[PDB]
Design a protein around this ligand. Structure first.
Ligand SMILES: OC[C@H]1O[C@H](OC[C@H]2O[C@@H](O[C@H]3[C@H](O)[C@H](O)[C@@H](O)O[C@@H]3CO[C@H]3O[C@H](CO)[C@H](O)[C@H](O)[C@H]3O)[C@@H](O)[C@@H](O)[C@@H]2O[C@@H]2O[C@H](CO)[C@@H](O)[C@H](O)[C@@H]2O)[C@H](O)[C@@H](O)[C@H]1O
Ligand SMILES: *[C@@H]1O[C@H](CO)[C@@H](O)[C@H](O)[C@H]1NC(C)=O
Ligand SMILES: [Cl-]
Length: 312
């Protein structure tokens, strides 16, 4: 069954308490609501009637290579505000490649997390710790670690989901097979936990295939991102079962991203997702994926937690 002990023995009380709360809720057939982007969370409050429990945001535009092209990151204040309002925060990282950005017509700099938008080679970087690219990877990790340390100084625990969707291959970190991506994940875990003393993090992995798994010693929560056909609100039992066997059923299981919110009237005892995070834009705002009447039902449900109900 899911562990309530963070893999970082030095975890803060706020990180320990968040993991224990999520495990308890999921064991009871309760799922936390979530939404990517503060403006979309505001839309849900304004149109559906509830603030999502979890705010998903991204370190993307703090990536050092993106700063070189004029990017201005602004999500750390949104984490602080959501936490001040009683919510929970998850970060992903659409990591702009440390070198190799093309910045062409078809591959603008602002797409430089996609494999197609950069020359960057994660495998060549990880095989040579003396290389410029290896040193730039560690510098990028240090850049994002500073942001996480600001959040740790404020006693804000974070559901940290780096190197997401890795196995798909469409982001540069997944373009050179599993070994290089696992090595980068474990390097990040060590650099953040040990060198930086980051103790406010719960580590969320986001690939299903066992050959991509970085190990139970460096992961607190396993997840997948599901973009089913518009209007498919099934519980996604097969994916849930694959995420249980990934860890020998020792880690909490969640949805990192959804296009379609799984119907909470059909998940109980089939696929006890700890949380889901709806993507931004049309996925939450339109009528094709998650219609207004359905959203109102989901967010009002007894077995869905919204921000007003969070009680860590
Ligand atoms: O490539 C065409 C694209 O145009 C518009 O999006 C542009 C926007 O795309 C960002 O990547 C998205 C991606 O489009 C898709 O929604 C999904 O894969 O997510 C990624 C990453 O999302 C991240 O950014 C958004 C806000 O854009 C949000 O905060 C989310 O939380 C975060 O995870 C990304 O490439 C952006 O850079 C890009 O916008 C550009 O942004 C830069 C500054 O970052 C500006 O300088 C630039 O002018 C432009 O706005 C459509 O929205 C999309 O549908 C697709 O058509
Ligand atoms: C990226 O490409 C655009 C479009 O050609 C160009 O105007 C811009 O100066 C480039 N950015 C950098 C920092 O070279
Ligand atoms: Cl503490």
């Amino acid at each position: 069954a899911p562990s309530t002990t963070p893999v970082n023995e030095k975890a803060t009380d706020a990180a320990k308490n968040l993991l224990s709360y999520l495990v308890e809720q999921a064991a009871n057939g309760v799922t936390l609501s979530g939404q990517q982007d503060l403006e979309s969370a505001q839309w849900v409050s304004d149109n559906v009637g509830k603030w999502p429990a979890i705010l998903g945001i991204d370190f993307m535009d703090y990536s050092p290579s993106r700063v070189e092209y004029g990017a201005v990151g602004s999500t750390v204040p949104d984490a602080i505000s959501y936490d001040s309002d009683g919510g929970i925060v998850t970060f992903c990282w659409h990591w702009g490649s440390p070198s190799g950005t093309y910045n062409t017509t078809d591959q603008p700099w602002w797409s430089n997390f996609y494999t197609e938008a950069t020359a960057f080679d994660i495998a060549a970087a990880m095989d040579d710790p003396d290389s410029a690219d290896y040193n730039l990877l560690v510098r990028d990790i240090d850049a994002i670690s500073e942001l996480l340390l600001q959040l740790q100084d404020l006693d804000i625990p974070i559901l940290w989901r780096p190197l997401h969707q890795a196995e798909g291959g469409w982001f540069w970190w997944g373009a050179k097979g599993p070994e290089a991506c696992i090595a980068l994940y474990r390097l990040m875990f060590d650099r953040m936990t040990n060198h930086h003393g980051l103790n406010n993090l719960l580590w969320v992995w986001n690939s299903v295939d066992p050959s991509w798994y970085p190990g139970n010693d460096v992961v607190d929560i396993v997840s997948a991102d599901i973009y089913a056909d518009a209007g498919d609100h099934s519980p996604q039992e097969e994916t849930f079962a694959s995420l249980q066997s990934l860890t020998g059923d020792t880690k909490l299981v969640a949805l990192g991203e959804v296009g379609n919110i799984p119907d909470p009237a059909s998940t109980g005892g089939v696929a006890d997702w700890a949380y889901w995070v709806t993507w931004n834009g049309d996925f939450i705002k339109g009528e094709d994926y998650n219609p207004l009447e359905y959203k109102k039902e989901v967010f009002s449900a007894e077995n869905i937690i919204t921000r007003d109900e969070v009680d860590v």
